[PDB]
CSV table of C-alpha atoms and ligand atoms in Angstrom, one decimal:
chain,number,residue,atom,x,y,z
K,1,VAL,CA,-4.8,8.3,-4.3
K,2,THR,CA,-1.7,7.7,-6.5
K,3,UNK,CA,-2.3,3.9,-7.0
K,4,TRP,CA,1.2,2.2,-7.7
K,5,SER,CA,0.5,-0.3,-4.9
K,6,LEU,CA,-2.0,1.4,-2.6
K,7,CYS,CA,-4.8,0.1,-4.8
K,8,UNK,CA,-5.2,-3.1,-2.7
K,9,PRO,CA,-1.9,-4.9,-1.4
K,10,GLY,CA,-2.6,-5.4,2.3
K,11,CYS,CA,-6.4,-5.0,1.8
K,12,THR,CA,-7.0,-8.8,1.8
K,13,UNK,CA,-7.7,-11.1,-1.3
K,14,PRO,CA,-6.6,-14.8,-0.3
K,15,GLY,CA,-7.4,-16.3,-3.7
K,16,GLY,CA,-9.9,-19.0,-2.6
K,17,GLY,CA,-12.9,-18.7,-4.9
K,18,UNK,CA,-11.7,-15.4,-6.4
K,19,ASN,CA,-13.7,-12.1,-7.0
K,20,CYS,CA,-11.4,-9.8,-5.0
K,21,UNK,CA,-9.3,-7.9,-7.7
K,22,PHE,CA,-6.1,-9.8,-6.9
K,23,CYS,CA,-8.1,-12.6,-8.4
K,24,UNK,CA,-11.1,-10.7,-9.7
R,101,LIG,C1,7.4,5.5,0.0
R,101,LIG,C2,6.4,6.5,0.6
R,101,LIG,C3,5.8,7.4,-0.5
R,101,LIG,C4,4.9,8.5,0.1
R,101,LIG,C5,4.6,9.6,-1.0
R,101,LIG,C6,4.0,10.9,-0.4
R,101,LIG,C7,2.6,10.8,0.0
R,101,LIG,C8,2.1,12.1,0.8
R,101,LIG,C9,0.7,12.0,1.4
R,101,LIG,C10,-0.4,12.5,0.3
R,101,LIG,C11,-1.8,12.4,0.9
R,101,LIG,C12,-2.9,13.0,0.0
R,101,LIG,O1,-3.0,12.3,-1.2
R,101,LIG,P1,-4.1,12.7,-2.3
R,101,LIG,O2,-4.8,13.9,-2.0
R,101,LIG,O3,-5.0,11.6,-2.6
R,101,LIG,O4,-2.9,12.8,-3.4
R,101,LIG,C13,-2.3,14.1,-3.6
R,101,LIG,C14,-3.1,14.9,-4.7
R,101,LIG,N1,-2.6,16.3,-5.0
R,101,LIG,C15,-1.1,16.4,-5.5
R,101,LIG,C16,-3.4,16.9,-6.2
R,101,LIG,C17,-2.8,17.3,-3.8
R,102,LIG,C1,-1.1,8.2,1.2
R,102,LIG,C2,-1.7,8.5,-0.2
R,102,LIG,C3,-3.1,8.1,-0.4
R,102,LIG,C4,-4.2,9.1,0.3
R,102,LIG,C5,-5.6,8.8,-0.2
R,102,LIG,C6,-6.6,9.8,0.5
R,102,LIG,C7,-8.0,9.7,-0.1
R,102,LIG,C8,-9.1,10.6,0.5
R,102,LIG,C9,-9.6,10.2,1.9
R,102,LIG,C10,-10.8,11.0,2.4
R,102,LIG,C11,-11.4,10.5,3.8
R,102,LIG,C12,-10.6,11.1,5.0
R,102,LIG,O1,-10.7,10.1,6.1
R,102,LIG,P1,-9.4,9.2,6.5
R,102,LIG,O2,-8.4,10.0,7.2
R,102,LIG,O3,-8.9,8.5,5.3
R,102,LIG,O4,-10.4,8.3,7.4
R,102,LIG,C13,-9.8,7.5,8.4
R,102,LIG,C14,-10.1,8.2,9.8
R,102,LIG,N1,-9.9,7.3,11.1
R,102,LIG,C15,-8.4,6.9,11.2
R,102,LIG,C16,-10.3,8.1,12.3
R,102,LIG,C17,-10.7,6.0,11.0
R,103,LIG,C1,-2.1,6.0,18.1
R,103,LIG,C2,-1.6,6.6,16.8
R,103,LIG,C3,-2.7,7.5,16.1
R,103,LIG,C4,-2.0,8.5,15.0
R,103,LIG,C5,-1.7,7.8,13.6
R,103,LIG,C6,-2.9,7.4,12.7
R,103,LIG,C7,-3.6,8.6,12.1
R,103,LIG,C8,-4.9,8.3,11.4
R,103,LIG,C9,-4.7,7.8,9.9
R,103,LIG,C10,-4.2,8.9,8.9
R,103,LIG,C11,-4.7,8.8,7.5
R,103,LIG,C12,-4.2,7.5,6.7
R,103,LIG,O1,-4.9,7.6,5.4
R,103,LIG,P1,-4.5,6.4,4.3
R,103,LIG,O2,-4.5,5.1,4.9
R,103,LIG,O3,-3.3,6.7,3.6
R,103,LIG,O4,-5.8,6.8,3.5
R,103,LIG,C13,-6.7,5.8,3.0
R,103,LIG,C14,-7.9,6.5,2.3
R,103,LIG,N1,-9.1,5.5,1.9
R,103,LIG,C15,-9.8,4.9,3.1
R,103,LIG,C16,-10.1,6.3,1.1
R,103,LIG,C17,-8.6,4.4,0.9
R,104,LIG,C1,11.8,19.8,3.6
R,104,LIG,C2,10.5,19.0,3.4
R,104,LIG,C3,10.6,18.1,2.1
R,104,LIG,C4,9.3,17.2,1.9
R,104,LIG,C5,9.5,16.3,0.6
R,104,LIG,C6,8.2,15.7,0.2
R,104,LIG,C7,8.3,14.9,-1.2
R,104,LIG,C8,7.0,14.2,-1.6
R,104,LIG,C9,7.1,13.7,-3.0
R,104,LIG,C10,5.8,13.0,-3.5
R,104,LIG,C11,5.8,12.6,-5.0
R,104,LIG,C12,4.5,11.9,-5.5
R,104,LIG,O1,4.7,11.3,-6.8
R,104,LIG,P1,4.7,12.3,-8.1
R,104,LIG,O2,4.3,13.7,-7.8
R,104,LIG,O3,3.9,11.7,-9.2
R,104,LIG,O4,6.3,12.0,-8.2
R,104,LIG,C13,7.1,13.1,-8.6
R,104,LIG,C14,8.5,12.6,-8.9
R,104,LIG,N1,9.5,13.7,-9.5
R,104,LIG,C15,9.8,14.8,-8.5
R,104,LIG,C16,10.8,13.0,-9.9
R,104,LIG,C17,8.9,14.4,-10.8
R,105,LIG,C1,16.6,-1.2,-3.1
R,105,LIG,C2,15.5,-1.5,-4.1
R,105,LIG,C3,15.8,-0.8,-5.5
R,105,LIG,C4,14.8,-1.2,-6.6
R,105,LIG,C5,15.0,-0.5,-7.9
R,105,LIG,C6,14.1,-1.1,-9.0
R,105,LIG,C7,14.2,-0.3,-10.4
R,105,LIG,C8,13.3,1.0,-10.3
R,105,LIG,C9,13.3,1.7,-11.7
R,105,LIG,C10,12.4,3.0,-11.8
R,105,LIG,C11,10.9,2.7,-12.3
R,105,LIG,C12,10.0,1.9,-11.4
R,105,LIG,O1,9.9,2.4,-10.1
R,105,LIG,P1,9.0,3.7,-9.8
R,105,LIG,O2,7.9,3.9,-10.7
R,105,LIG,O3,9.9,4.9,-9.7
R,105,LIG,O4,8.6,3.1,-8.4
R,105,LIG,C13,7.3,2.6,-8.2
R,105,LIG,C14,7.2,1.1,-8.7
R,105,LIG,N1,5.8,0.3,-8.5
R,105,LIG,C15,4.8,0.9,-9.4
R,105,LIG,C16,6.0,-1.1,-8.9
R,105,LIG,C17,5.4,0.4,-7.0
R,106,LIG,C1,11.7,15.5,5.4
R,106,LIG,C2,13.2,15.2,5.2
R,106,LIG,C3,13.5,14.3,4.0
R,106,LIG,C4,13.2,15.1,2.6
R,106,LIG,C5,13.8,14.3,1.4
R,106,LIG,C6,13.5,15.0,0.1
R,106,LIG,C7,14.1,14.3,-1.2
R,106,LIG,C8,13.4,13.0,-1.6
R,106,LIG,C9,14.0,12.5,-2.9
R,106,LIG,C10,13.3,11.2,-3.4
R,106,LIG,C11,13.9,10.6,-4.7
R,106,LIG,C12,13.1,9.4,-5.2
R,106,LIG,O1,13.3,9.3,-6.6
R,106,LIG,P1,12.2,9.9,-7.6
R,106,LIG,O2,12.7,10.0,-9.0
R,106,LIG,O3,11.6,11.2,-7.2
R,106,LIG,O4,11.2,8.7,-7.4
R,106,LIG,C13,9.9,8.8,-7.9
R,106,LIG,C14,9.1,7.6,-7.3
R,106,LIG,N1,7.5,7.5,-7.7
R,106,LIG,C15,7.4,7.4,-9.2
R,106,LIG,C16,6.9,6.3,-7.0
R,106,LIG,C17,6.8,8.8,-7.2
R,107,LIG,C1,13.6,-2.2,4.1
R,107,LIG,C2,12.6,-1.1,4.4
R,107,LIG,C3,13.2,0.3,4.5
R,107,LIG,C4,12.2,1.4,4.8
R,107,LIG,C5,12.7,2.9,4.7
R,107,LIG,C6,12.7,3.5,3.3
R,107,LIG,C7,11.2,3.9,2.8
R,107,LIG,C8,11.2,4.7,1.5
R,107,LIG,C9,11.4,3.8,0.2
R,107,LIG,C10,11.6,4.7,-1.0
R,107,LIG,C11,12.0,3.9,-2.3
R,107,LIG,C12,10.8,3.3,-3.0
R,107,LIG,O1,11.2,2.9,-4.3
R,107,LIG,P1,10.2,2.8,-5.5
R,107,LIG,O2,9.2,3.9,-5.6
R,107,LIG,O3,9.5,1.5,-5.6
R,107,LIG,O4,11.4,2.9,-6.6
R,107,LIG,C13,11.9,4.2,-6.9
R,107,LIG,C14,13.1,4.0,-7.8
R,107,LIG,N1,13.9,5.3,-8.3
R,107,LIG,C15,14.4,6.1,-7.1
R,107,LIG,C16,15.0,4.9,-9.2
R,107,LIG,C17,12.9,6.2,-9.1
R,108,LIG,C1,-1.8,0.3,13.3
R,108,LIG,C2,-3.3,0.1,13.8
R,108,LIG,C3,-4.1,-0.5,12.6
R,108,LIG,C4,-5.6,-0.7,13.1
R,108,LIG,C5,-6.5,-1.0,11.9
R,108,LIG,C6,-8.1,-1.0,12.3
R,108,LIG,C7,-9.0,-1.1,11.1
R,108,LIG,C8,-9.2,0.3,10.3
R,108,LIG,C9,-10.0,0.2,9.0
R,108,LIG,C10,-9.9,1.4,8.2
R,108,LIG,C11,-10.5,1.2,6.7
R,108,LIG,C12,-10.0,2.3,5.8
R,108,LIG,O1,-8.5,2.2,5.6
R,108,LIG,P1,-8.0,1.3,4.3
R,108,LIG,O2,-8.5,1.9,3.0
R,108,LIG,O3,-8.3,-0.1,4.5
R,108,LIG,O4,-6.5,1.8,4.7
R,108,LIG,C13,-5.6,2.1,3.6
R,108,LIG,C14,-5.2,0.7,2.9
R,108,LIG,N1,-4.9,0.8,1.4
R,108,LIG,C15,-3.7,1.8,1.1
R,108,LIG,C16,-4.4,-0.6,0.9
R,108,LIG,C17,-6.1,1.3,0.6
R,109,LIG,C1,10.4,-9.6,6.5
R,109,LIG,C2,11.4,-10.8,6.4
R,109,LIG,C3,12.3,-10.8,5.1
R,109,LIG,C4,11.5,-11.2,3.8
R,109,LIG,C5,12.3,-11.0,2.5
R,109,LIG,C6,11.5,-11.5,1.3
R,109,LIG,C7,12.2,-11.1,0.0
R,109,LIG,C8,11.3,-11.4,-1.2
R,109,LIG,C9,11.9,-11.0,-2.6
R,109,LIG,C10,11.0,-11.4,-3.8
R,109,LIG,C11,10.4,-10.1,-4.5
R,109,LIG,C12,9.3,-9.4,-3.7
R,109,LIG,O1,8.6,-8.5,-4.6
R,109,LIG,P1,7.5,-7.5,-4.0
R,109,LIG,O2,7.7,-7.3,-2.6
R,109,LIG,O3,6.1,-7.9,-4.4
R,109,LIG,O4,8.1,-6.4,-4.9
R,109,LIG,C13,9.3,-5.6,-4.5
R,109,LIG,C14,9.9,-5.0,-5.7
R,109,LIG,N1,11.3,-4.3,-5.5
R,109,LIG,C15,12.4,-5.3,-5.0
R,109,LIG,C16,11.8,-3.8,-6.9
R,109,LIG,C17,11.2,-3.1,-4.6
R,110,LIG,C1,-1.5,-3.4,6.1
R,110,LIG,C2,-1.3,-4.7,6.9
R,110,LIG,C3,-1.6,-6.0,6.1
R,110,LIG,C4,-1.2,-7.3,7.0
R,110,LIG,C5,-1.5,-8.6,6.2
R,110,LIG,C6,-1.0,-9.8,7.0
R,110,LIG,C7,-1.4,-11.2,6.3
R,110,LIG,C8,-0.7,-12.4,7.0
R,110,LIG,C9,0.8,-12.5,6.5
R,110,LIG,C10,1.6,-13.5,7.4
R,110,LIG,C11,3.1,-13.8,6.9
R,110,LIG,C12,4.1,-12.6,7.2
R,110,LIG,O1,3.7,-11.4,6.5
R,110,LIG,P1,4.2,-11.1,5.0
R,110,LIG,O2,3.8,-12.2,4.1
R,110,LIG,O3,5.7,-10.9,4.9
R,110,LIG,O4,3.4,-9.8,4.9
R,110,LIG,C13,2.1,-9.7,4.3
R,110,LIG,C14,2.2,-9.7,2.8
R,110,LIG,N1,0.9,-9.5,2.0
R,110,LIG,C15,0.2,-8.2,2.3
R,110,LIG,C16,1.2,-9.5,0.5
R,110,LIG,C17,-0.1,-10.7,2.2
R,111,LIG,C1,7.8,5.8,8.7
R,111,LIG,C2,8.6,4.4,8.8
R,111,LIG,C3,8.1,3.4,7.8
R,111,LIG,C4,6.8,2.6,8.3
R,111,LIG,C5,6.3,1.5,7.3
R,111,LIG,C6,5.3,0.6,7.8
R,111,LIG,C7,5.0,-0.6,6.8
R,111,LIG,C8,3.9,-1.6,7.3
R,111,LIG,C9,3.7,-2.7,6.2
R,111,LIG,C10,2.5,-3.7,6.6
R,111,LIG,C11,2.4,-4.8,5.5
R,111,LIG,C12,1.9,-4.3,4.1
R,111,LIG,O1,1.9,-5.4,3.1
R,111,LIG,P1,3.3,-5.5,2.2
R,111,LIG,O2,3.2,-6.8,1.4
R,111,LIG,O3,4.5,-5.3,2.9
R,111,LIG,O4,2.8,-4.3,1.3
R,111,LIG,C13,3.7,-3.9,0.2
R,111,LIG,C14,3.1,-4.5,-1.1
R,111,LIG,N1,4.1,-5.2,-2.1
R,111,LIG,C15,4.7,-6.5,-1.4
R,111,LIG,C16,3.3,-5.7,-3.3
R,111,LIG,C17,5.2,-4.3,-2.5
R,112,LIG,C1,10.0,3.9,12.8
R,112,LIG,C2,9.1,2.8,13.4
R,112,LIG,C3,8.3,2.1,12.3
R,112,LIG,C4,7.2,1.1,12.8
R,112,LIG,C5,6.4,0.5,11.7
R,112,LIG,C6,5.2,-0.3,12.3
R,112,LIG,C7,4.3,-1.0,11.2
R,112,LIG,C8,3.1,-1.7,11.8
R,112,LIG,C9,2.1,-2.2,10.8
R,112,LIG,C10,0.8,-2.8,11.5
R,112,LIG,C11,-0.3,-3.1,10.5
R,112,LIG,C12,-1.6,-3.7,11.2
R,112,LIG,O1,-2.6,-4.1,10.3
R,112,LIG,P1,-3.3,-5.5,10.5
R,112,LIG,O2,-2.3,-6.6,10.7
R,112,LIG,O3,-4.3,-5.9,9.6
R,112,LIG,O4,-3.8,-5.1,12.0
R,112,LIG,C13,-5.2,-4.6,12.1
R,112,LIG,C14,-6.1,-5.9,12.6
R,112,LIG,N1,-7.5,-5.5,13.0
R,112,LIG,C15,-8.4,-4.9,11.9
R,112,LIG,C16,-8.2,-6.9,13.4
R,112,LIG,C17,-7.6,-4.6,14.3
R,113,LIG,C1,6.0,7.4,15.0
R,113,LIG,C2,5.7,7.8,13.5
R,113,LIG,C3,4.9,6.7,12.8
R,113,LIG,C4,5.8,5.4,12.4
R,113,LIG,C5,5.1,4.6,11.3
R,113,LIG,C6,3.9,3.7,11.7
R,113,LIG,C7,3.2,3.0,10.5
R,113,LIG,C8,1.9,2.3,10.9
R,113,LIG,C9,1.2,1.7,9.7
R,113,LIG,C10,-0.2,1.1,10.0
R,113,LIG,C11,-0.9,0.6,8.7
R,113,LIG,C12,-2.3,0.1,9.0
R,113,LIG,O1,-2.8,-0.7,7.9
R,113,LIG,P1,-3.9,0.0,6.9
R,113,LIG,O2,-3.8,-0.6,5.5
R,113,LIG,O3,-3.8,1.5,6.9
R,113,LIG,O4,-5.0,-0.6,7.8
R,113,LIG,C13,-6.4,-0.6,7.2
R,113,LIG,C14,-7.1,-2.0,7.5
R,113,LIG,N1,-6.6,-3.2,6.7
R,113,LIG,C15,-5.2,-3.7,7.2
R,113,LIG,C16,-7.5,-4.4,6.9
R,113,LIG,C17,-6.5,-2.9,5.2
């Protein structure tokens, strides 16, 4: 899976509210 940046970025997380790893 190698992470680094594949562990979300592009997978959506707008920031309104929170609870999605980017915010969470
Ligand atoms: C800038 C682009 C960078 C690309 C880097 C190369 C990615 C090649 C595709 C890898 C797909 C499979 O991945 P994975 O089985 O979860 O990991 C590899 C795990 N082992 C080493 C133990 C087999
Ligand atoms: C590039 C480095 C990261 C690789 C991480 C791999 C983790 C193991 C994935 C195992 C599941 C294999 O199904 P996939 O092909 O993913 O399912 C997508 C198939 N369609 C396109 C037809 C919908
Ligand atoms: C019309 C063109 C069709 C041919 C090109 C598309 C081939 C199908 C996709 C190739 C595999 C891409 O796996 P990935 O996103 O690195 O794995 C993500 C793994 N998880 C879902 C578990 C996070
Ligand atoms: C002729 C065909 C050539 C194909 C070349 C494919 C290269 C894929 C490389 C994927 C590397 C995945 O990251 P890693 O293993 O943790 O980094 C290793 C970094 N060093 C080598 C400096 C230790
Ligand atoms: C043209 C742009 C050149 C940028 C050069 C920046 C300095 C790089 C120093 C080398 C160490 C850092 O990078 P790396 O762990 O090998 O890469 C993956 C980095 N991320 C985890 C954030 C995705
Ligand atoms: C298929 C034809 C093209 C083959 C090209 C083969 C040579 C590729 C050399 C690539 C040199 C890149 O630097 P590095 O130290 O390994 O970065 C390591 C970066 N990670 C920590 C994110 C894994
Ligand atoms: C403008 C878009 C061009 C697309 C074509 C090129 C795609 C491949 C990018 C590969 C570079 C990604 O560098 P990184 O792993 O973050 O740093 C690695 C830094 N060192 C080499 C010093 C270890
Ligand atoms: C070019 C055509 C695109 C069409 C897309 C249609 C929806 C397919 C949904 C596929 C869901 C599984 O993949 P995923 O874990 O989200 O993908 C890899 C993303 N990350 C590296 C950030 C984990
Ligand atoms: C597509 C139209 C052109 C847009 C140009 C925007 C430039 C934004 C520059 C601000 C930094 C963006 O940092 P990031 O992407 O999160 O990290 C990339 C990290 N390295 C540079 C080391 C690879
Ligand atoms: C894997 C595909 C993900 C597509 C996500 C599109 C969201 C709408 C962006 C519209 C503005 C142009 O785009 P960008 O801000 O330069 O790129 C997206 C950068 N993030 C992934 C960090 C948000
Ligand atoms: C084989 C030729 C190369 C094809 C490459 C296609 C790339 C499609 C990118 C779709 C948008 C993905 O979101 P992004 O913000 O740009 O993701 C990088 C995440 N950081 C900004 C944090 C570094
Ligand atoms: C050498 C030529 C390189 C060409 C590189 C092309 C990169 C194209 C990246 C396209 C990323 C598309 O993801 P997205 O916006 O979320 O669409 C999927 C939207 N639905 C789930 C609603 C269907
Ligand atoms: C002709 C040789 C190939 C050229 C390169 C084409 C690169 C196309 C990249 C397409 C990337 C598609 O986004 P993804 O994250 O996997 O979508 C999964 C669903 N979300 C966007 C919602 C997370």
